[PDB]
Design a protein around this ligand. Structure first.
Ligand SMILES: CCCCCCCCCCCCCCCCCC(=O)OC[C@H](COP(=O)([O-])OCC(O)COP(=O)([O-])OC[C@@H](COC(=O)CCCCCCCCCCCCCCCCC)OC(=O)CCCCCCCCCCCCCCCCC)OC(=O)CCCCCCCCCCCCCCCCC
Ligand SMILES: CCCCCCCCCCCCCC(=O)OC[C@H](COP(=O)(O)OCC[N+](C)(C)C)OC(=O)CCCCCCCCCCCCC
Ligand SMILES: CCCCCC(=O)OC[C@H](COP(=O)([O-])OCCN)OC(=O)CCCCC
Ligand SMILES: CCCCCC(=O)OC[C@H](COP(=O)([O-])OCCN)OC(=O)CCCCC
Lengths: 425, 105, 446, 34, 49, 61, 49
């Protein structure tokens, strides 16, 4: 019988300095460790914009315990990996390797995050990588729109871009990197997660090397939702557009209602080259639009705010038709036209999607690290499905009501000669 | 530790004045031979130290053209000679030796 | 504590069973709420003739469009309603249809897969609508220089053979493929001993076998009298194809020698050597300090935007080599450094770098089989190529056998003084002449 | 390799309606590595 | 110039000693042949003429 | 001799450049002895009476 | 549309061994190289003499 052993359940610890440790021994051949930090681009201000982007690119620069040459060769010697993933709220320093080399890569991880030197010449040589890295990301039109959508939505913090403003390329200083690490990479802002690691080891590492004090308080300044529109005329073949309203902070019950509304409206495709029969946005637009297009509900939740809406791609001349058809479909939901089989199928898509998002070690580690910083706890899957089941249909209708009546934020790129402004919707 | 130390330092100060690069306003690190380790260290110098190094060498070459020296007041005093380049060069050498030790295994 | 070696023993054994009709049923049980299950078919464009070269890809466009039991989007609604995901792909040798769904939905997921692979209703109205879709996809694929240059490499390397054909087929075939061509393709290739019902996730192998006898017993396991397809060996040809197009901003180059195939033990040592050469992207953080000489030289001197090594396996043949993308004044230097590393590994491979390649492959193997869907693919595809699931403990044994001598011997066998196949696309005026490339495959000093 | 995920050299062209599905964004993430 | 003393460099020398031995045979035979070195060629069987 | 003759010459002698050069220098050695031997035997057969080494027997001393 | 490209037939140029699409070129890989490199080695021998 190839029945597997009994799976060990995760262990979790909050140290009195605010640091969070969470380990899971899955006895896998590989180990994964990640240091999640409340250091995303929201914590930049108008004087040091882009500092967290350059910081994201500087994980292999020289540290006090490891030269730049050694970090690259030591990790590659044991076939390991070092990555830095960054959202508007978090930075996630993750390291992967086989079980027997965790000591090696933990030491590199601690040096990168707790003892970088930011040598003036090494930083100078890295500045052009901001332009390369930004250019590679921004050849997806989706990256432009979402970055402009946040700049238009918020007055500060969440308005900040994941990528360095062009005027700052070459201008980010080693002092700014030092200052950014010193007041954001602190114990009360950190979470040390490890898969294929023992809890005593992580707890030992955390107490020995991650007892960093000083710095700043949690979450910095609050994100002030504004509303507005940013329009980028570039004559692309297709018009990309996003229309949203403020929705709900992550961790609140109202956020689950928005998540369920997302899968009622239609989040993404489930069948290859399918017509998206159960996608209410796609069928609404498909009625009076026969040209090619795409439409999808957009859901972004943060510590102190959120954005909900939809994202459209269409021909430049059909942009207004696609947008107005999509917006009206949400209005009918706000008007109470929502069946119970619709919400139950959406819960199935949502519940199934969550479980599928944590079957890999990479996706599991990111979820546990995200929960540790957002919620300060670990919520197992069964409890998450419980919270999803608790969403009532009236909660979903109310979220749709909040979107229709809320002050809108919009971003669009392309030939915008037929893309409406907000006041034309 | 004055007795034996000051005699050694006394012979070093003798040699320093005998070398005579101070007579052109130069410092010791201005006279080092530029190999690959030294070009990198010079590259790593901050703006002010680089610009100071450039003008002192330019002033010395101008003197060498004219077969002149500075007045004695403007000679580089042995006690005031700053080894501004040595710490950068030491790191550059330490980095190269690390590469070489990795190239052996 | 637990070691790396001990962790390899903890991997569950992949159970295997075969139905009476010949359908092979394989599964690796985990402790997961989700699973991936699908059918891997030993069919692809290498089995297709010049007439019907686009049929299997055409069938992929029709597999999810309706069946005799669930016509129209009825299948599409059942998958979406239970939150599951339905997907498929076709290569030159293998076709796959698989579903990602909750473990509780495994009985329905298996039922749908059986309905798709047996009772696909290829309605004429749907065939004509998927005609224009495929043609539009051909226009899109023309804009991907990576997909183009790799089809060019196959076109010249295996010229005159079935492997020279593309998976999607030519433009002309898609406008005259009839329903009879597609049904003849299906009824001739979708036989039970060439299909593998693979699954992975939270599920007992018993229930998968029950669902197999329940929904796949109604399948023809009796081949035709003498219409059993047999793959002929495909002649490799040292040759070159150069699509000069200076209007494009970067050159794409693919070069390769003939590999041995899926079941050859030498693939392990070849993959170690490719790991030593590795890959590069202009967004990597290592740059000058990267271990691979090709990668560090390319980063420091800006010789390319990216390169990748590959070992593409087929039945008794394959493409072993690399591909890169660079400015028009850098093609010659990239070719020079690339070939220099091939010759260096043939003649002067050291022990420490080989331990590097072994370690990279160990991490690449373990990190890839991380999730229900990659494991389900490794189950289905391995049973077609190897006829069995090769446990990770066996791969570790083959990797550990590799030392510097093995890499020098294995690489010389396939690289040294061999005729490569070259494929060039873009601003390729500086692409070296074939004789000069061929001369780069040996060293006068050796 | 550098990543930009938001869904929850001339790149290529998207022409038909089948190849557009999945492209509409659905909270950006940026990832860098070695 | 001590940096060339290491395990990798002695594995590299071991890979190239068969080749350098053979290039010595090429030069030795080439020198004997080009100069008609009677001291060595008297021992070769058929060459004796 | 089931493998091709040219095939066995390549695997043994021509694959490496070092042995490819050794076969040439050793070939020029044995080629020089046989070529001069056969060439001189042809020049002498056409001129059998005429040469001095064909008349050296008359002048014993 | 780039899939409409096929490499033309070289059958009236190929060597005898490599004309069969259903036969591996590895079979005659050994002999073909030796024939061409034999011609080179003979040329050097003649130049050498
Ligand atoms: C007369 C003296 C001869 C001098 C050359 C001796 C060989 C030498 O210098 O070693 C380098 C040369 C490099 O050969 P390799 O191993 O292919 O190295 C490839 C490098 O990556 C370099 O690869 P690459 O891609 O840069 O170029 C390959 C290079 C390979 O050829 C050479 O490098 C030879 C240079 C020409 C020598 C002059 C002719 C005599 O090809 C040429 O340059 C040949 C073109 C010559 C055309 C001349 C007619 C006009 O090494 C040898 O040739 C060693 C064998 C020597 C045999 C001599 C027999 C006695
Ligand atoms: C103390 C005295 C020492 C002397 C000892 C005698 C040394 C004899 C030479 C030995 C070196 C032979 C090495 C060699 O052949 O490589 C150079 C090229 C390449 O040959 P190739 O067959 O093209 O490719 C070699 C690949 N391999 C090794 C894997 C089979 O092969 C060639 O191209 C050589 C043949 C070309 C001859 C024409 C060049 C000579 C100058 C032209 C003179 C005639 C016109 C005036
Ligand atoms: C004493 C001889 C020194 C070596 C000179 C020599 O052989 O030149 C190299 C080329 C053949 O090597 P390649 O062009 O295949 O490049 C192989 C690289 N891997 O040979 C030629 O055809 C050049 C003609 C030289 C005649 C003087
Ligand atoms: C460097 C230039 C060398 C040229 C010397 C020379 O004239 O060679 C003549 C001898 C003749 O061989 P031998 O058996 O009569 O011996 C007669 C002894 N005098 O051949 C040799 O001995 C060649 C030796 C090569 C050594 C580098």
């Amino acid at each position: 019988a190839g029945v597997p052993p009994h799976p060990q359940d995760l262990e979790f610890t909050r140290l009195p300095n605010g640091l969070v440790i969470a380990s899971l021994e899955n006895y896998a051949p590989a180990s994964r460790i990640g240091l999640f930090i409340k250091a995303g681009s929201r914590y930049e201000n108008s004087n040091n914009l882009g500092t967290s982007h350059l910081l994201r690119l500087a994980s292999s620069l020289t540290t006090k315990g490891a030269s730049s040459f050694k970090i690259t060769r030591g990790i590659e010697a044991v076939g390991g990996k070092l990555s830095v993933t960054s959202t508007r709220e978090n930075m996630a320093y993750t390291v992967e390797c086989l079980r027997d080399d965790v000591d090696i890569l933990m030491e590199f991880l601690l040096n990168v995050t707790t003892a970088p030197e930011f040598r003036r010449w090494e930083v100078a040589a890295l500045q052009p990588q901001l332009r390369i890295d930004k250019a590679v990301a921004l050849q997806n039109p989706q990256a432009h729109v979402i970055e402009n959508l946040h700049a238009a939505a918020y007055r500060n913090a969440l308005a900040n871009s994941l990528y360095c403003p062009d005027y700052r390329i070459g201008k980010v200083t080693p002092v700014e990197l030092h200052d950014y690490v010193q007041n954001h990479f602190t114990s009360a802002r950190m979470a040390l997660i490890g898969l294929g690691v023992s809890h005593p080891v992580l707890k030992q590492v955390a107490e020995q090397f991650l007892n960093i004090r000083g710095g700043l308080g949690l979450s910095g300044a609050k994100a002030k939702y504004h509303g507005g529109e940013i329009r980028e005329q570039n004559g692309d073949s297709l018009v990309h557009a996003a229309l949203v309203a403020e929705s709900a902070a992550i961790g609140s019950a109202e956020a689950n209602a928005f998540s369920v509304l997302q899968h009622v409206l239609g989040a993404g495709p489930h069948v290859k080259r399918g017509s998206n029969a159960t996608s209410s946005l796609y069928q609404a637009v498909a009625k009076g639009v026969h040209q090619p297009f795409d439409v999808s509900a957009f859901n972004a939740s943060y510590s102190d705010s959120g954005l909900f809406g939809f994202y459209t791609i269409s021909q430049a001349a059909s942009a207004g038709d696609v947008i107005k058809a999509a917006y009206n479909q949400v209005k009918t939901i706000a008007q109470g036209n929502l069946s119970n089989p619709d919400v139950q199928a959406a819960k199935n898509k949502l519940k199934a999607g969550y479980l599928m998002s944590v079957e890999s070690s990479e996706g599991f580690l990111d979820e546990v690290g995200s929960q540790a910083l957002a919620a300060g706890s670990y919520t197992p899957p069964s409890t998450v499905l419980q919270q999803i089941d608790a969403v009532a249909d009236a909660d979903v209708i109310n979220a749709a009501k909040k979107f229709v009546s809320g002050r809108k934020s919009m971003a669009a790129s392309g030939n915008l000669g037929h893309t409406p402004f907000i006041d034309e919707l | 530790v004055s007795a034996s130390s000051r005699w050694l330092e006394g012979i070093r100060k003798w040699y320093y004045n005998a070398a005579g690069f101070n007579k052109l306003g130069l410092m010791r690190d201005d006279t080092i031979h530029e190999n690959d380790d030294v070009k990198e260290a010079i590259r790593r110098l901050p703006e002010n130290l680089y610009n100071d190094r450039v003008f002192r060498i330019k002033r010395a070459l101008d003197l060498s053209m004219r077969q002149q020296i500075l007045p004695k007041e403007q000679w580089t005093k042995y006690e005031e000679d700053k080894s501004y380049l040595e710490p950068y060069l030491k790191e550059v050498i330490r980095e190269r030796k690390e590469r070489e030790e990795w190239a052996k295994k | 504590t637990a070691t790396y070696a001990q962790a390899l023993q903890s991997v569950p054994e992949t159970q295997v069973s075969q139905l009476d009709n010949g359908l092979r049923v394989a599964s690796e049980q985990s402790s997961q709420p989700t699973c991936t299950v699908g059918v891997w078919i030993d069919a692809g464009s290498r089995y297709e003739s010049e007439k019907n070269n686009g049929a299997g890809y055409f069938v992929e466009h029709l597999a999810f469009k309706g069946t005799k039991n669930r016509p129209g989007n009825a299948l599409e609604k059942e998958v979406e309603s239970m939150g599951a995901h339905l997907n498929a792909y076709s290569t030159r040798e293998h076709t796959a249809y698989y579903i990602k769904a909750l473990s509780k939905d495994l009985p329905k997921a298996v039922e749908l897969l059986a309905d798709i692979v047996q009772n696909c209703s290829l309605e004429d109205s749907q065939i004509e609508k998927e005609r224009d879709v495929i043609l539009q996809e051909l226009q899109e694929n023309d804009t991907s220089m990576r997909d183009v240059v790799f089809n060019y490499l196959h076109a010249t390397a295996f010229q005159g053979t079935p492997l020279a054909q593309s998976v999607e087929g030519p433009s002309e075939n898609v406008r005259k493929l009839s329903r009879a061509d597609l049904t003849e393709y299906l009824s001739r290739h979708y036989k039970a001993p060439r299909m593998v019902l693979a699954a992975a996730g939270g599920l007992e192998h018993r229930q998968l076998l029950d669902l197999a006898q329940k929904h796949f017993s109604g399948l023809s396991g009796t081949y035709d009298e003498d219409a059993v397809p047999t793959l002929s060996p495909c002649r490799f040809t040292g040759s070159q194809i150069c699509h000069r197009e200076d209007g494009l901003p970067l050159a794409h180059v693919a070069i390769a020698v003939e590999g041995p195939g899926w079941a050859h033990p030498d693939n392990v040592a070849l993959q170690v050597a490719n790991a030593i050469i590795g890959h590069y992207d202009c967004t990597y953080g290592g740059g000058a300090h990267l271990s691979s000489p090709l990668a560090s030289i390319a980063a420091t001197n800006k010789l390319c935007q990216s390169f990748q090594t590959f070992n593409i396996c087929y039945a008794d043949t394959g493409l072993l080599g690399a591909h890169f993308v660079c400015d028009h004044m850098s093609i010659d230097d990239m070719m020079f450094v690339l070939q220099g590393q091939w010759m260096r590994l043939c003649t002067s491979a050291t022990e420490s770098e080989v331990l590097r390649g072994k370690n990279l492959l160990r991490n690449a193997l373990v990190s890839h089989l991380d999730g229900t869907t990659p494991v389900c693919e490794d189950i289905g595809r391995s049973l077609l190529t190897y006829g069995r699931r090769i446990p990770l403990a066996e791969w570790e044994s083959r990797i550990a056998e590799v030392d510097a001598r093995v890499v020098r011997e294995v690489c010389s066998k396939y690289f040294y003084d061999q005729c490569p196949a070259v494929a060039g696309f873009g601003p390729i005026e500086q692409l070296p002449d074939y004789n000069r490339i061929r001369s780069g495959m040996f060293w006068l000093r050796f | 390799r550098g990543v930009a995920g938001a869904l929850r050299d001339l790149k290529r062209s998207v022409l038909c309606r089948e190849s557009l599905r999945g492209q509409a964004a659905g909270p950006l993430v940026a990832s860098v590595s070695l | 110039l001590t940096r060339f003393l290491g395990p990798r460099y002695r594995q590299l020398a071991r890979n190239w000693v068969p080749t350098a031995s053979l290039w010595g045979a090429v030069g030795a035979v080439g020198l004997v042949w080009a100069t008609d070195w009677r001291l060595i060629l008297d021992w070769v069987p058929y060459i004796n003429g | 001799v089931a493998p091709t003759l040219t095939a066995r010459l390549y695997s043994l002698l021509f694959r490496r450049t070092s042995t490819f050069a050794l076969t040439i220098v050793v070939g020029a050695l044995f080629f020089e002895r046989a070529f001069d031997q056969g060439a001189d035997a042809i020049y002498e057969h056409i001129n059998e009476g005429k040469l001095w080494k064909h008349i050296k027997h008359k002048y014993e001393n | 549309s780039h899939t409409d490209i096929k490499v033309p037939d070289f059958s009236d140029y190929r060597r005898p061994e490599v004309l069969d699409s259903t036969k591996s070129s590895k079979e005659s890989s050994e002999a073909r190289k030796g024939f061409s490199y034999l011609v080179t080695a003979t040329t050097t021998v003649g130049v050498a003499y």
